[PDB]
């Protein structure tokens, strides 16, 4: 199953301050569940762009609709990959979860692009769950069982009644 | 207050590297005055400590696998 | 809508008259305790001399425990049957009347004389999948809104 | 012997069913009849029951499944 | 319907214009993270010169664990906020309550701000009324359960008694 | 404390000796599979010529779906069953109730069998009396209130400062 | 056929119940007796039961309810 | 940071309106210099965008009902 | 890994031949409605003249409420049954256990049938061992919780304290 | 009763006075929103000249998912906080624990603050013990389950076998 | 009557079981004696054909390697 | 920006007291200039109010019980 969301915001400031903010956005009081950020790799490529890969660890609650055994607080690793193109003054950022991926994959793309007098940031999120197939399988077993049970009950009941008749 | 590394021992190293990077990012890279790594020492120290710690964490397979992805 | 099909066959070592009479009288009995009541809605003999009956049953039962977080204690079931006394043959059809949004369970059974041979096929049809999608859509929305707030705010804070 | 979903009808239902059983076993299946010889008891029963069935929220769905011919 | 009451009072070491203006601008702020939006539905000055406003808020939050399992989860709720300002007396009255999930709970909060020239301070008195029906829901589910079970138990008593009576006559 | 009452009546087309005797031997029977054991605790003839019996039954079963989800599940209940028989008037009085799990619920049942010469039948009249969350709700409301008082004081003060 | 909560008592219990059933049907209900004609079987059964029951954590609630008069 | 409208398209309009109303609230109304609405341009814009968004939402009846109520 | 034991003894007022034959034919029967099928996998007479049988039953039933409700619901279990009959001594030994759902629980039962000429009766001794890993599952969940709570609290302390220390100036 | 231990260390790049004073004034702060109130219960200087303080904190919070679902939800906890400051050696000891909800869990924390002139820094060592006993509740339910299943099965055998033996002797 | 887990095998199972039972009671327990190989062959060919499709065959083969009556 | 007492009535009092303690803590106690209670007045108002509130509270027993303990002894 896949769900998609989008958002736009305009930052009343220059591309340099924004992108710099992004690299340093943690900690901040609006983001309390963030435990760590680590820089895995960073360099400027052949075409002159800065390429960074970072690792975050967050704390949080797994969703109510998940199996109530996995409910509770856990920690998730998240990867964040970014490209800055200083020529066009544009930035692309991508995060996705590394673990709990069987349950969901939640990916976020956000592009910052300059408008010569503000930085326009476009956000896209794609959510994906395999929960649907798990539920479906559990249903298959339920149906098999209900069917088999009902066949025994039919056979017994009809016997009991046919006898009580004759 | 500054960011923590998942390995507290690296936090100090991390802080230095990050500090260094900020400067270079703002003053050199974006203004076209540089496209090279003027943070090699701090970076080496940080990433050594970090990889040392990373071997211990059971997440390294997943991270390695996900670095082979190209999301753009 | 997921669909699963099951089939079954039974052999009764006795006469069609007794099987079909038993079918009309199979409740109550100790092996089918969930049957609360059975009522005859309509019965007549049709153009070709066949008996056509429609009955109404109420059985109790629980929705499966894992579907709960996405229920009702009682279900109504319609049972429709044709008996052909010439050929000694019978056809029956049952299905639930309500909770059809969740699941529909249809069972066709044909009885025929040889001993009396019974052929059953059940079609389960589900939408249990469709139920999750609603709760997940809601969760997704709320989460996205929360995060949109945190991204904007956090970023503004640091930009300051 | 079966209960009706509306207890008030149960007794009558028992009378109708008893009669129907004899007509079915002795007459219809023996090829001696193609009519409904149980009209008194049937009428009583079907009146009581339909009185109950209007109260129940099931009459629409039941009617829809009666316009269907699953055969 | 259960009704619970709470009261609270705060004293602001400041003036009515600052307090009331803050109230109209109290979101966003770092201590109120679940507030997602505020909108002004209507605003006008009445016959007596008092300012009348109705605003609409959206909050995110989890429903309490004690609700039925189908409603459990995280949701967004709408809140109405209705306020009157009297600039003559320097007084303000506000009232908020949730618009949806009203089956589950209703939470009403009345708050009166009044200026006090004596203490040179603005006094705010809040009273909150929680009113629910979860209790009525439990009582209902139980009653239905009882009827159904009673039916089963009387059925089994009758069926069983008949069975045994029949078997004890073949003798 | 919730109290519910129910009544039901049945007519057995047979004689008092048969109905009452069947009652003393009513288990096992195919409709009562969850009954595990029956024991006669005491039996005597009283001053007025009646037989007074006390019996102890044990049954298995699932606790009702509306309880705290930790006590939900399958358990065993002990039941006391007390009876008086009057051979003269051909009447019987019975009383059953659970001995344990009473903290959760009490279910009492009276059933009287009486012979009716008119119908040549035994008439059975059964009467049943069935007889914490609010605390949890109270605690919830106090907490939500305290949290919210904090948030209002803090938030308001914050904004008032920023407007200065 | 029914079992006692103490398996060791079930046979004695059967013997007793058998005797009582006969006495109840043939003597008591017919007014030909208002005495206890099951002394021995009842003694064996009830000795065993009280032996087994006293070990049970159930004996208090039971005793409590036996002081009670539901009529 | 300025508050969001439940409909993002209205946020900017809302800001303008609120801004204008703020100026009026402090400088005129509270000081007794006015009992009229000097913000009707911005208000009209805002309220049109909002009520447009509000029709899609299932809340207009409930909002109206508690608005017909007088908690005072 | 939690283990519970139960033992029970039943006495059949009849001869070993009748009891053991009943055992080989104990299903279907009205008191065991959840048994869906029984099948004979292998049957042989061994070196010592004993009958060695292996059977497969399929049962339906509901998983217990104490299990993770993600596994809760109704299902089917396969059960294997192994038996030895010694016709000389008139004795029988049997063993059953579930083949599947072993992740949730393993439930084993050994039973010996023996003739006692004194009572003219066949005495059947049953010993059952229930064993589950549920306990380890709870403990693990609690541990992860503790680890996470601790991390959160370390962050809150470092951040908060640093904040207040900064506020002093 | 399970016991889990965690230990941690932090280094404050500042002097003991600032750290310890910060300690007595750590609330409110934006990273600790669940703290509702703090009160000083008793404070005195002891014979050996060290400051001895006892304080009472109240927190709001959610009970862990792993507790009995009848207890799940949000509540309030009282916490006692006991400390000694040694102005001579520049050292501090603190101890906290929950006063209520001890049926569910006990969480203890000992922390020593110390000045280290070498690094010109204050080193804080924390050692936490979690203890529960929740387990004994769960196990109890399982026991009961097993007992009942076993009894049922005995019934089913005894009846079932008897039945079959009967059906065979009629032959 | 008794069901095989694979309906196609049930008649076969009956025959086999019928045969085994006689042999069990009349020859084996009386020391007078494999007279069921035909019925056994048919039955077991059907069952094993059915078991290959079943997902329990690994576990079953594995459990058939265990000897629960040894030590 | 000031912490609350569990009893609202005491907060202002608590604040006065805390302010006083702070000055004494940083300037006199930590510098070896004092080992007595130079905040007795504020301490008096605040603690009288607090204990008044505490009497009504259901935690007074658990708290009293925990105050007889000495977690730093051995």
mmCIF file with all atom_site columns, C-alpha atoms in Angstrom, chain F residues 6-164:
data_model
loop_
_atom_site.group_PDB
_atom_site.id
_atom_site.type_symbol
_atom_site.label_atom_id
_atom_site.label_alt_id
_atom_site.label_comp_id
_atom_site.label_asym_id
_atom_site.label_entity_id
_atom_site.label_seq_id
_atom_site.pdbx_PDB_ins_code
_atom_site.Cartn_x
_atom_site.Cartn_y
_atom_site.Cartn_z
_atom_site.occupancy
_atom_site.B_iso_or_equiv
_atom_site.pdbx_formal_charge
_atom_site.auth_seq_id
_atom_site.auth_comp_id
_atom_site.auth_asym_id
_atom_site.auth_atom_id
_atom_site.pdbx_PDB_model_num
ATOM 1   C CA . UNK F 1 6   ? -34.375 -11.530 33.757 1.00 0.00 ? 6   UNK F CA 1
ATOM 2   C CA . UNK F 1 7   ? -37.245 -14.006 33.669 1.00 0.00 ? 7   UNK F CA 1
ATOM 3   C CA . UNK F 1 8   ? -38.186 -16.942 31.457 1.00 0.00 ? 8   UNK F CA 1
ATOM 4   C CA . UNK F 1 9   ? -40.706 -19.805 31.635 1.00 0.00 ? 9   UNK F CA 1
ATOM 5   C CA . UNK F 1 10  ? -40.890 -23.261 30.055 1.00 0.00 ? 10  UNK F CA 1
ATOM 6   C CA . UNK F 1 11  ? -43.467 -26.038 30.048 1.00 0.00 ? 11  UNK F CA 1
ATOM 7   C CA . UNK F 1 12  ? -42.350 -29.652 30.277 1.00 0.00 ? 12  UNK F CA 1
ATOM 8   C CA . UNK F 1 13  ? -45.063 -31.982 28.929 1.00 0.00 ? 13  UNK F CA 1
ATOM 9   C CA . UNK F 1 14  ? -44.262 -34.599 31.600 1.00 0.00 ? 14  UNK F CA 1
ATOM 10  C CA . UNK F 1 15  ? -44.529 -35.515 35.319 1.00 0.00 ? 15  UNK F CA 1
ATOM 11  C CA . UNK F 1 16  ? -42.851 -33.829 38.302 1.00 0.00 ? 16  UNK F CA 1
ATOM 12  C CA . UNK F 1 17  ? -40.929 -37.008 39.210 1.00 0.00 ? 17  UNK F CA 1
ATOM 13  C CA . UNK F 1 18  ? -39.375 -36.952 35.757 1.00 0.00 ? 18  UNK F CA 1
ATOM 14  C CA . UNK F 1 19  ? -38.451 -33.297 35.587 1.00 0.00 ? 19  UNK F CA 1
ATOM 15  C CA . UNK F 1 20  ? -37.051 -33.060 39.100 1.00 0.00 ? 20  UNK F CA 1
ATOM 16  C CA . UNK F 1 21  ? -35.170 -36.395 38.785 1.00 0.00 ? 21  UNK F CA 1
ATOM 17  C CA . UNK F 1 22  ? -33.683 -35.267 35.486 1.00 0.00 ? 22  UNK F CA 1
ATOM 18  C CA . UNK F 1 23  ? -32.605 -32.110 37.297 1.00 0.00 ? 23  UNK F CA 1
ATOM 19  C CA . UNK F 1 24  ? -30.621 -34.217 39.802 1.00 0.00 ? 24  UNK F CA 1
ATOM 20  C CA . UNK F 1 25  ? -29.038 -36.035 36.864 1.00 0.00 ? 25  UNK F CA 1
ATOM 21  C CA . UNK F 1 26  ? -28.942 -33.240 34.278 1.00 0.00 ? 26  UNK F CA 1
ATOM 22  C CA . UNK F 1 27  ? -25.184 -33.616 33.588 1.00 0.00 ? 27  UNK F CA 1
ATOM 23  C CA . UNK F 1 28  ? -23.519 -34.556 31.423 1.00 0.00 ? 28  UNK F CA 1
ATOM 24  C CA . UNK F 1 29  ? -25.676 -33.630 28.454 1.00 0.00 ? 29  UNK F CA 1
ATOM 25  C CA . UNK F 1 30  ? -24.665 -32.573 24.977 1.00 0.00 ? 30  UNK F CA 1
ATOM 26  C CA . UNK F 1 31  ? -25.734 -28.946 25.484 1.00 0.00 ? 31  UNK F CA 1
ATOM 27  C CA . UNK F 1 32  ? -23.636 -28.445 28.567 1.00 0.00 ? 32  UNK F CA 1
ATOM 28  C CA . UNK F 1 33  ? -20.129 -29.403 27.513 1.00 0.00 ? 33  UNK F CA 1
ATOM 29  C CA . UNK F 1 34  ? -18.406 -26.901 29.802 1.00 0.00 ? 34  UNK F CA 1
ATOM 30  C CA . UNK F 1 35  ? -19.577 -28.525 33.025 1.00 0.00 ? 35  UNK F CA 1
ATOM 31  C CA . UNK F 1 36  ? -16.601 -30.326 34.587 1.00 0.00 ? 36  UNK F CA 1
ATOM 32  C CA . UNK F 1 37  ? -17.920 -31.929 37.793 1.00 0.00 ? 37  UNK F CA 1
ATOM 33  C CA . UNK F 1 38  ? -20.912 -32.119 40.143 1.00 0.00 ? 38  UNK F CA 1
ATOM 34  C CA . UNK F 1 39  ? -20.855 -33.066 43.810 1.00 0.00 ? 39  UNK F CA 1
ATOM 35  C CA . UNK F 1 40  ? -23.515 -33.484 46.450 1.00 0.00 ? 40  UNK F CA 1
ATOM 36  C CA . UNK F 1 41  ? -22.326 -31.536 49.490 1.00 0.00 ? 41  UNK F CA 1
ATOM 37  C CA . UNK F 1 42  ? -25.284 -32.279 51.784 1.00 0.00 ? 42  UNK F CA 1
ATOM 38  C CA . UNK F 1 43  ? -28.681 -33.888 51.632 1.00 0.00 ? 43  UNK F CA 1
ATOM 39  C CA . UNK F 1 44  ? -31.331 -34.067 54.343 1.00 0.00 ? 44  UNK F CA 1
ATOM 40  C CA . UNK F 1 45  ? -35.079 -34.161 54.995 1.00 0.00 ? 45  UNK F CA 1
ATOM 41  C CA . UNK F 1 46  ? -36.193 -31.080 56.947 1.00 0.00 ? 46  UNK F CA 1
ATOM 42  C CA . UNK F 1 47  ? -38.866 -30.605 59.625 1.00 0.00 ? 47  UNK F CA 1
ATOM 43  C CA . UNK F 1 48  ? -41.678 -30.036 57.077 1.00 0.00 ? 48  UNK F CA 1
ATOM 44  C CA . UNK F 1 49  ? -40.881 -33.191 55.042 1.00 0.00 ? 49  UNK F CA 1
ATOM 45  C CA . UNK F 1 50  ? -38.791 -31.600 52.257 1.00 0.00 ? 50  UNK F CA 1
ATOM 46  C CA . UNK F 1 51  ? -35.466 -32.808 50.742 1.00 0.00 ? 51  UNK F CA 1
ATOM 47  C CA . UNK F 1 52  ? -32.755 -30.159 51.023 1.00 0.00 ? 52  UNK F CA 1
ATOM 48  C CA . UNK F 1 53  ? -29.707 -30.687 48.866 1.00 0.00 ? 53  UNK F CA 1
ATOM 49  C CA . UNK F 1 54  ? -26.623 -28.586 48.406 1.00 0.00 ? 54  UNK F CA 1
ATOM 50  C CA . UNK F 1 55  ? -24.386 -29.375 45.454 1.00 0.00 ? 55  UNK F CA 1
ATOM 51  C CA . UNK F 1 56  ? -21.119 -27.998 44.119 1.00 0.00 ? 56  UNK F CA 1
ATOM 52  C CA . UNK F 1 57  ? -20.537 -27.746 40.363 1.00 0.00 ? 57  UNK F CA 1
ATOM 53  C CA . UNK F 1 58  ? -17.369 -26.720 38.560 1.00 0.00 ? 58  UNK F CA 1
ATOM 54  C CA . UNK F 1 59  ? -17.577 -25.366 34.999 1.00 0.00 ? 59  UNK F CA 1
ATOM 55  C CA . UNK F 1 60  ? -15.031 -24.041 32.512 1.00 0.00 ? 60  UNK F CA 1
ATOM 56  C CA . UNK F 1 61  ? -15.666 -20.973 30.395 1.00 0.00 ? 61  UNK F CA 1
ATOM 57  C CA . UNK F 1 62  ? -14.511 -17.686 28.915 1.00 0.00 ? 62  UNK F CA 1
ATOM 58  C CA . UNK F 1 63  ? -14.879 -14.558 31.049 1.00 0.00 ? 63  UNK F CA 1
ATOM 59  C CA . UNK F 1 64  ? -17.163 -11.983 29.320 1.00 0.00 ? 64  UNK F CA 1
ATOM 60  C CA . UNK F 1 65  ? -15.636 -9.732  26.634 1.00 0.00 ? 65  UNK F CA 1
ATOM 61  C CA . UNK F 1 66  ? -16.386 -6.498  28.567 1.00 0.00 ? 66  UNK F CA 1
ATOM 62  C CA . UNK F 1 67  ? -13.931 -7.086  31.497 1.00 0.00 ? 67  UNK F CA 1
ATOM 63  C CA . UNK F 1 68  ? -10.368 -5.731  31.912 1.00 0.00 ? 68  UNK F CA 1
ATOM 64  C CA . UNK F 1 69  ? -8.469  -7.358  29.018 1.00 0.00 ? 69  UNK F CA 1
ATOM 65  C CA . UNK F 1 70  ? -6.031  -9.104  31.421 1.00 0.00 ? 70  UNK F CA 1
ATOM 66  C CA . UNK F 1 71  ? -8.759  -11.111 33.241 1.00 0.00 ? 71  UNK F CA 1
ATOM 67  C CA . UNK F 1 72  ? -10.349 -11.888 29.880 1.00 0.00 ? 72  UNK F CA 1
ATOM 68  C CA . UNK F 1 73  ? -9.470  -15.407 28.776 1.00 0.00 ? 73  UNK F CA 1
ATOM 69  C CA . UNK F 1 74  ? -10.625 -18.836 29.880 1.00 0.00 ? 74  UNK F CA 1
ATOM 70  C CA . UNK F 1 75  ? -11.034 -19.784 33.504 1.00 0.00 ? 75  UNK F CA 1
ATOM 71  C CA . UNK F 1 76  ? -12.982 -22.139 35.796 1.00 0.00 ? 76  UNK F CA 1
ATOM 72  C CA . UNK F 1 77  ? -15.810 -21.144 38.095 1.00 0.00 ? 77  UNK F CA 1
ATOM 73  C CA . UNK F 1 78  ? -17.251 -22.958 41.122 1.00 0.00 ? 78  UNK F CA 1
ATOM 74  C CA . UNK F 1 79  ? -21.040 -22.836 41.462 1.00 0.00 ? 79  UNK F CA 1
ATOM 75  C CA . UNK F 1 80  ? -23.232 -23.605 44.451 1.00 0.00 ? 80  UNK F CA 1
ATOM 76  C CA . UNK F 1 81  ? -26.624 -25.097 43.713 1.00 0.00 ? 81  UNK F CA 1
ATOM 77  C CA . UNK F 1 82  ? -29.205 -25.401 46.526 1.00 0.00 ? 82  UNK F CA 1
ATOM 78  C CA . UNK F 1 83  ? -32.576 -27.119 46.296 1.00 0.00 ? 83  UNK F CA 1
ATOM 79  C CA . UNK F 1 84  ? -35.767 -27.936 48.173 1.00 0.00 ? 84  UNK F CA 1
ATOM 80  C CA . UNK F 1 85  ? -38.237 -30.588 46.961 1.00 0.00 ? 85  UNK F CA 1
ATOM 81  C CA . UNK F 1 86  ? -41.785 -30.848 48.294 1.00 0.00 ? 86  UNK F CA 1
ATOM 82  C CA . UNK F 1 87  ? -43.154 -34.275 47.360 1.00 0.00 ? 87  UNK F CA 1
ATOM 83  C CA . UNK F 1 88  ? -46.558 -33.371 48.802 1.00 0.00 ? 88  UNK F CA 1
ATOM 84  C CA . UNK F 1 89  ? -47.304 -30.240 46.737 1.00 0.00 ? 89  UNK F CA 1
ATOM 85  C CA . UNK F 1 90  ? -45.019 -31.625 44.000 1.00 0.00 ? 90  UNK F CA 1
ATOM 86  C CA . UNK F 1 91  ? -42.858 -28.501 43.872 1.00 0.00 ? 91  UNK F CA 1
ATOM 87  C CA . UNK F 1 92  ? -39.135 -27.723 43.567 1.00 0.00 ? 92  UNK F CA 1
ATOM 88  C CA . UNK F 1 93  ? -37.046 -24.661 44.282 1.00 0.00 ? 93  UNK F CA 1
ATOM 89  C CA . UNK F 1 94  ? -33.471 -24.204 43.044 1.00 0.00 ? 94  UNK F CA 1
ATOM 90  C CA . UNK F 1 95  ? -30.797 -21.569 43.431 1.00 0.00 ? 95  UNK F CA 1
ATOM 91  C CA . UNK F 1 96  ? -27.443 -21.387 41.673 1.00 0.00 ? 96  UNK F CA 1
ATOM 92  C CA . UNK F 1 97  ? -24.631 -18.884 41.942 1.00 0.00 ? 97  UNK F CA 1
ATOM 93  C CA . UNK F 1 98  ? -20.901 -18.511 41.425 1.00 0.00 ? 98  UNK F CA 1
ATOM 94  C CA . UNK F 1 99  ? -18.725 -18.947 44.507 1.00 0.00 ? 99  UNK F CA 1
ATOM 95  C CA . UNK F 1 100 ? -15.611 -17.463 42.971 1.00 0.00 ? 100 UNK F CA 1
ATOM 96  C CA . UNK F 1 101 ? -15.011 -14.624 40.451 1.00 0.00 ? 101 UNK F CA 1
ATOM 97  C CA . UNK F 1 102 ? -17.542 -12.562 42.459 1.00 0.00 ? 102 UNK F CA 1
ATOM 98  C CA . UNK F 1 103 ? -15.278 -9.528  42.355 1.00 0.00 ? 103 UNK F CA 1
ATOM 99  C CA . UNK F 1 104 ? -15.933 -9.458  38.643 1.00 0.00 ? 104 UNK F CA 1
ATOM 100 C CA . UNK F 1 105 ? -19.656 -10.422 38.686 1.00 0.00 ? 105 UNK F CA 1
ATOM 101 C CA . UNK F 1 106 ? -22.328 -12.227 40.641 1.00 0.00 ? 106 UNK F CA 1
ATOM 102 C CA . UNK F 1 107 ? -24.920 -14.240 38.719 1.00 0.00 ? 107 UNK F CA 1
ATOM 103 C CA . UNK F 1 108 ? -27.773 -15.734 40.728 1.00 0.00 ? 108 UNK F CA 1
ATOM 104 C CA . UNK F 1 109 ? -30.536 -17.949 39.368 1.00 0.00 ? 109 UNK F CA 1
ATOM 105 C CA . UNK F 1 110 ? -33.814 -19.020 40.923 1.00 0.00 ? 110 UNK F CA 1
ATOM 106 C CA . UNK F 1 111 ? -35.815 -21.677 39.179 1.00 0.00 ? 111 UNK F CA 1
ATOM 107 C CA . UNK F 1 112 ? -39.057 -23.127 40.429 1.00 0.00 ? 112 UNK F CA 1
ATOM 108 C CA . UNK F 1 113 ? -40.657 -26.249 39.017 1.00 0.00 ? 113 UNK F CA 1
ATOM 109 C CA . UNK F 1 114 ? -44.286 -26.807 39.876 1.00 0.00 ? 114 UNK F CA 1
ATOM 110 C CA . UNK F 1 115 ? -46.659 -29.496 38.722 1.00 0.00 ? 115 UNK F CA 1
ATOM 111 C CA . UNK F 1 116 ? -49.819 -28.413 36.950 1.00 0.00 ? 116 UNK F CA 1
ATOM 112 C CA . UNK F 1 117 ? -52.601 -31.022 36.949 1.00 0.00 ? 117 UNK F CA 1
ATOM 113 C CA . UNK F 1 118 ? -54.538 -28.943 34.415 1.00 0.00 ? 118 UNK F CA 1
ATOM 114 C CA . UNK F 1 119 ? -51.933 -29.253 31.679 1.00 0.00 ? 119 UNK F CA 1
ATOM 115 C CA . UNK F 1 120 ? -50.608 -32.566 33.089 1.00 0.00 ? 120 UNK F CA 1
ATOM 116 C CA . UNK F 1 121 ? -47.348 -30.668 32.814 1.00 0.00 ? 121 UNK F CA 1
ATOM 117 C CA . UNK F 1 122 ? -44.541 -29.244 34.875 1.00 0.00 ? 122 UNK F CA 1
ATOM 118 C CA . UNK F 1 123 ? -44.122 -25.445 34.730 1.00 0.00 ? 123 UNK F CA 1
ATOM 119 C CA . UNK F 1 124 ? -40.650 -23.957 35.209 1.00 0.00 ? 124 UNK F CA 1
ATOM 120 C CA . UNK F 1 125 ? -40.197 -20.300 36.116 1.00 0.00 ? 125 UNK F CA 1
ATOM 121 C CA . UNK F 1 126 ? -36.629 -19.044 36.021 1.00 0.00 ? 126 UNK F CA 1
ATOM 122 C CA . UNK F 1 127 ? -35.453 -15.728 37.397 1.00 0.00 ? 127 UNK F CA 1
ATOM 123 C CA . UNK F 1 128 ? -31.879 -14.378 37.153 1.00 0.00 ? 128 UNK F CA 1
ATOM 124 C CA . UNK F 1 129 ? -30.131 -11.521 38.983 1.00 0.00 ? 129 UNK F CA 1
ATOM 125 C CA . UNK F 1 130 ? -26.844 -10.316 37.447 1.00 0.00 ? 130 UNK F CA 1
ATOM 126 C CA . UNK F 1 131 ? -24.819 -7.922  39.580 1.00 0.00 ? 131 UNK F CA 1
ATOM 127 C CA . UNK F 1 132 ? -13.597 0.963   38.352 1.00 0.00 ? 132 UNK F CA 1
ATOM 128 C CA . UNK F 1 133 ? -13.410 2.627   34.927 1.00 0.00 ? 133 UNK F CA 1
ATOM 129 C CA . UNK F 1 134 ? -14.589 5.916   36.418 1.00 0.00 ? 134 UNK F CA 1
ATOM 130 C CA . UNK F 1 135 ? -11.385 5.945   38.449 1.00 0.00 ? 135 UNK F CA 1
ATOM 131 C CA . UNK F 1 136 ? -9.230  5.666   35.333 1.00 0.00 ? 136 UNK F CA 1
ATOM 132 C CA . UNK F 1 137 ? -11.213 8.472   33.685 1.00 0.00 ? 137 UNK F CA 1
ATOM 133 C CA . UNK F 1 138 ? -10.817 10.650  36.787 1.00 0.00 ? 138 UNK F CA 1
ATOM 134 C CA . UNK F 1 139 ? -7.045  10.210  36.745 1.00 0.00 ? 139 UNK F CA 1
ATOM 135 C CA . UNK F 1 140 ? -6.987  10.947  33.030 1.00 0.00 ? 140 UNK F CA 1
ATOM 136 C CA . UNK F 1 141 ? -8.921  14.189  33.495 1.00 0.00 ? 141 UNK F CA 1
ATOM 137 C CA . UNK F 1 142 ? -6.795  15.413  36.393 1.00 0.00 ? 142 UNK F CA 1
ATOM 138 C CA . UNK F 1 143 ? -3.646  14.706  34.360 1.00 0.00 ? 143 UNK F CA 1
ATOM 139 C CA . UNK F 1 144 ? -4.867  16.347  31.185 1.00 0.00 ? 144 UNK F CA 1
ATOM 140 C CA . UNK F 1 145 ? -5.937  19.282  33.275 1.00 0.00 ? 145 UNK F CA 1
ATOM 141 C CA . UNK F 1 146 ? -2.544  19.692  35.043 1.00 0.00 ? 146 UNK F CA 1
ATOM 142 C CA . UNK F 1 147 ? -0.583  19.331  31.821 1.00 0.00 ? 147 UNK F CA 1
ATOM 143 C CA . UNK F 1 148 ? -2.876  21.916  30.165 1.00 0.00 ? 148 UNK F CA 1
ATOM 144 C CA . UNK F 1 149 ? -2.619  24.422  33.017 1.00 0.00 ? 149 UNK F CA 1
ATOM 145 C CA . UNK F 1 150 ? 1.168   24.173  32.619 1.00 0.00 ? 150 UNK F CA 1
ATOM 146 C CA . UNK F 1 151 ? 0.988   24.634  28.855 1.00 0.00 ? 151 UNK F CA 1
ATOM 147 C CA . UNK F 1 152 ? -1.316  27.699  29.171 1.00 0.00 ? 152 UNK F CA 1
ATOM 148 C CA . UNK F 1 153 ? 0.756   29.437  31.849 1.00 0.00 ? 153 UNK F CA 1
ATOM 149 C CA . UNK F 1 154 ? 4.009   28.751  29.979 1.00 0.00 ? 154 UNK F CA 1
ATOM 150 C CA . UNK F 1 155 ? 2.751   29.516  26.489 1.00 0.00 ? 155 UNK F CA 1
ATOM 151 C CA . UNK F 1 156 ? 1.011   32.697  27.527 1.00 0.00 ? 156 UNK F CA 1
ATOM 152 C CA . UNK F 1 157 ? 4.032   33.963  29.407 1.00 0.00 ? 157 UNK F CA 1
ATOM 153 C CA . UNK F 1 158 ? 6.246   33.140  26.422 1.00 0.00 ? 158 UNK F CA 1
ATOM 154 C CA . UNK F 1 159 ? 4.089   35.110  23.977 1.00 0.00 ? 159 UNK F CA 1
ATOM 155 C CA . UNK F 1 160 ? 3.674   38.003  26.394 1.00 0.00 ? 160 UNK F CA 1
ATOM 156 C CA . UNK F 1 161 ? 7.451   38.205  26.690 1.00 0.00 ? 161 UNK F CA 1
ATOM 157 C CA . UNK F 1 162 ? 7.956   38.112  22.896 1.00 0.00 ? 162 UNK F CA 1
ATOM 158 C CA . UNK F 1 163 ? 5.461   41.023  22.546 1.00 0.00 ? 163 UNK F CA 1
ATOM 159 C CA . UNK F 1 164 ? 7.752   43.091  24.825 1.00 0.00 ? 164 UNK F CA 1
#
